[PDB]
Design an enzyme around this catalytic site. Structure first.
Site, mmCIF file in Angstrom:
data_model
loop_
_atom_site.group_PDB
_atom_site.id
_atom_site.type_symbol
_atom_site.label_atom_id
_atom_site.label_comp_id
_atom_site.label_asym_id
_atom_site.label_seq_id
_atom_site.Cartn_x
_atom_site.Cartn_y
_atom_site.Cartn_z
ATOM 1 N N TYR A 72 61.938 18.054 31.628
ATOM 2 C CA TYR A 72 62.580 19.382 31.712
ATOM 3 C C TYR A 72 63.930 19.342 32.433
ATOM 4 C CZ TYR A 72 58.215 21.044 29.789
ATOM 5 O OH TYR A 72 57.146 21.177 28.961
ATOM 6 N N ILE A 93 58.303 17.676 25.042
ATOM 7 C CA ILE A 93 59.305 16.905 25.808
ATOM 8 C C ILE A 93 59.464 15.503 25.192
ATOM 9 C CG2 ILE A 93 59.165 18.216 27.941
ATOM 10 C CD1 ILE A 93 57.309 15.982 29.041
ATOM 11 N N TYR A 114 45.083 16.269 27.725
ATOM 12 C CA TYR A 114 45.976 15.737 28.756
ATOM 13 C C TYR A 114 45.757 16.476 30.063
ATOM 14 C CZ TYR A 114 48.751 19.968 28.251
ATOM 15 O OH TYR A 114 49.158 21.264 28.187
ATOM 16 N N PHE A 173 51.431 12.110 33.366
ATOM 17 C CA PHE A 173 50.387 12.571 32.451
ATOM 18 C C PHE A 173 49.332 11.497 32.265
ATOM 19 C CE2 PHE A 173 54.154 14.885 31.135
ATOM 20 C CZ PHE A 173 53.708 16.169 30.946
ATOM 21 N N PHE A 209 49.759 20.553 37.409
ATOM 22 C CA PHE A 209 50.428 21.722 36.814
ATOM 23 C C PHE A 209 49.753 22.241 35.537
ATOM 24 C CE2 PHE A 209 53.036 18.127 35.385
ATOM 25 C CZ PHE A 209 52.948 18.259 34.025
ATOM 26 N N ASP A 210 49.000 21.405 34.832
ATOM 27 C CA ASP A 210 48.322 21.881 33.607
ATOM 28 C C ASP A 210 47.305 20.846 33.165
ATOM 29 O OD1 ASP A 210 48.101 24.086 31.781
ATOM 30 O OD2 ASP A 210 48.883 22.735 30.219
HETATM 31 C C1 LIG Z 1 51.991 24.114 27.668
HETATM 32 C C2 LIG Z 1 51.963 23.044 26.699
HETATM 33 C C3 LIG Z 1 53.047 22.004 26.628
HETATM 34 C C4 LIG Z 1 54.469 22.481 26.998
HETATM 35 N N1 LIG Z 1 55.466 21.543 26.447
HETATM 36 C C5 LIG Z 1 56.441 22.139 25.534
HETATM 37 C C6 LIG Z 1 55.791 22.550 24.240
HETATM 38 C C7 LIG Z 1 57.333 23.234 26.227
HETATM 39 O O1 LIG Z 1 57.318 23.347 27.477
HETATM 40 O O2 LIG Z 1 58.099 23.922 25.510
HETATM 41 C C8 LIG Z 1 55.554 20.235 26.677
HETATM 42 O O3 LIG Z 1 56.429 19.562 26.087
HETATM 43 C C9 LIG Z 1 54.699 19.480 27.583
HETATM 44 C C10 LIG Z 1 54.010 18.304 26.863
HETATM 45 C C11 LIG Z 1 52.974 18.853 25.895
HETATM 46 C C12 LIG Z 1 51.929 19.676 26.623
HETATM 47 C C13 LIG Z 1 52.532 20.803 27.475
HETATM 48 N N2 LIG Z 1 53.649 20.308 28.251
HETATM 49 S S1 LIG Z 1 53.420 20.151 29.880
HETATM 50 O O4 LIG Z 1 54.494 19.357 30.423
HETATM 51 O O5 LIG Z 1 52.071 19.750 30.143
HETATM 52 C C14 LIG Z 1 53.608 21.814 30.502
HETATM 53 C C15 LIG Z 1 54.881 22.276 30.753
HETATM 54 C C16 LIG Z 1 55.025 23.581 31.119
HETATM 55 CL CL1 LIG Z 1 56.596 24.270 31.377
HETATM 56 C C17 LIG Z 1 53.956 24.423 31.285
HETATM 57 C C18 LIG Z 1 52.694 23.911 31.058
HETATM 58 CL CL2 LIG Z 1 51.347 24.963 31.244
HETATM 59 C C19 LIG Z 1 52.495 22.602 30.628
#
Ligand SMILES: CC[C@H]1CN([C@@H](C)C(=O)O)C(=O)[C@@H]2CCC[C@H]1N2S(=O)(=O)c1cc(Cl)cc(Cl)c1
Ligand SMILES: CC[C@H]1CN([C@@H](C)C(=O)O)C(=O)[C@@H]2CCC[C@H]1N2S(=O)(=O)c1cc(Cl)cc(Cl)c1
Lengths: 128, 128
Positions: free
Chosen positions: B101, B75, B45, B118, B55-56
Site C-alpha cells: 500500500y 497488491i 490468508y 502474510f 490486520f485481517d
Molecule cells: C480485504 C481483502 C484484500 C484487500 N486487498 C485489495 C483487494 C485492496 O485493498 O484493494 C489486497 O490486495 C490485500 C491482499 C488480498 C487480501 C486482502 N488484502 S489485505 O492486505 O489482507 C487487506 C488490506 C486492507 Cl486495506 C484491508 C483488509 Cl481487511 C485486508
C-alpha cells in the site's frame, strides 16, 4: 426477487441492443459524471446466480473491489454497466452469459451458460 | 518468529531483486502447475503488520478469498507471490510497501509505508 425485477423492468444498456446487459437504478448518485475508460473505479457489489444464491460479495470482506474500467479486465457486463454509473449510484445489473463467463463458466462457483445478477455501488473513481 | 524467518531465509522473488517480496514455502503443495494470468485463485490468508498486529484473516469471516491473478486487483506482492504457489501450498510472504500500500497506506488499518506479512494457503485455482 431482485434478479427477476431486472429481467422484467431493466434498460438494455448494450451498445448491440442485444439485451445482454440490463440495468435498474436503485439509488441515484450525487455525482454528475460517469467514469472514463482507464479510470480506477471503486465499487461494492453483491453477486447472485439465477437460483437466487449469493456467489460473492465485497461487503463480506469490508473493502471495495477496485478495477481499471473498460480494459477487459472484468466481465464485459461490468465494463459496460459500471461505465453508466455516477458516484454514489447503486444499480441492479443482469448479465447474460455472453457478457459474463459464457458456455465454459468458471466452476466451481459459475455454471456453464449462467446469467448473473449484481447489486453494485459506485463509491469513487480516480484518473489513471 | 515467522516474520523473522522469512526476513532471514526467504527467497527474493522480485524481478528487480529489491527484497520487496520475500517467500518461504511452509507446507509443500500437490502437483507442479501454478496459476496463469487471469486464473481465479481461491486462498485463505492471515495478515500482520511489522508491529505484530493482525490486520485481517479470511478465516475470521469463514470466507475463502477469490481473485483473478495478475490484474493488479490485489497488491503487487500477492500477484507476484501467489503466481509461484502450487495447489495445497502454504507460504509466508513479507511484502515491502512498494509491493503493498505504499506511502499512502489504507488508513488506519494499513499504515503509511507498511511492510506486511502474510500466511497464504492456495486452496485451488481454476483456468479459463
Ligand atoms: C480485504 C481483502 C484484500 C484487500 N486487498 C485489495 C483487494 C485492496 O485493498 O484493494 C489486497 O490486495 C490485500 C491482499 C488480498 C487480501 C486482502 N488484502 S489485505 O492486505 O489482507 C487487506 C488490506 C486492507 Cl486495506 C484491508 C483488509 Cl481487511 C485486508
Ligand atoms: C473474483 C473476482 C471478480 C472476477 N471477475 C474478473 C476479475 C475475472 O473473472 O477475471 C469478474 O469480472 C467478476 C466481476 C468483478 C468481481 C468478480 N467477478 S464475479 O463475477 O463476482 C466472480 C467470478 C468468479 Cl469466477 C468468482 C467469484 Cl468469487 C466472483
Amino acid at each position: 426477487g431482485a434478479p427477476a425485477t431486472v429481467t422484467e423492468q431493466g434498460e438494455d444498456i448494450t451498445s448491440k441492443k442485444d439485451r445482454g446487459v440490463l440495468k435498474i437504478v436503485k439509488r441515484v448518485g450525487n455525482g454528475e459524471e460517469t467514469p472514463m475508460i482507464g479510470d480506477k473505479v471503486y465499487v461494492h457489489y453483491k453477486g447472485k446466480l439465477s437460483n437466487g444464491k449469493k456467489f460473492d460479495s465485497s461487503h463480506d470482506r469490508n473493502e471495495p473491489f477496485v478495477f481499471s474500467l473498460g480494459k477487459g479486465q472484468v466481465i464485459k457486463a461490468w465494463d459496460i454497466g459500471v461505465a453508466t454509473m455516477k458516484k454514489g449510484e447503486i444499480c441492479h445489473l443482469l448479465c447474460k452469459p455472453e457478457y459474463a463467463y459464457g458456455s465454459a463458466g468458471s466452476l466451481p462457483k459459475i455454471p456453464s451458460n449462467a446469467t448473473l445478477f449484481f447489486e453494485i455501488e459506485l463509491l469513487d473513481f480516480k484518473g489513471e
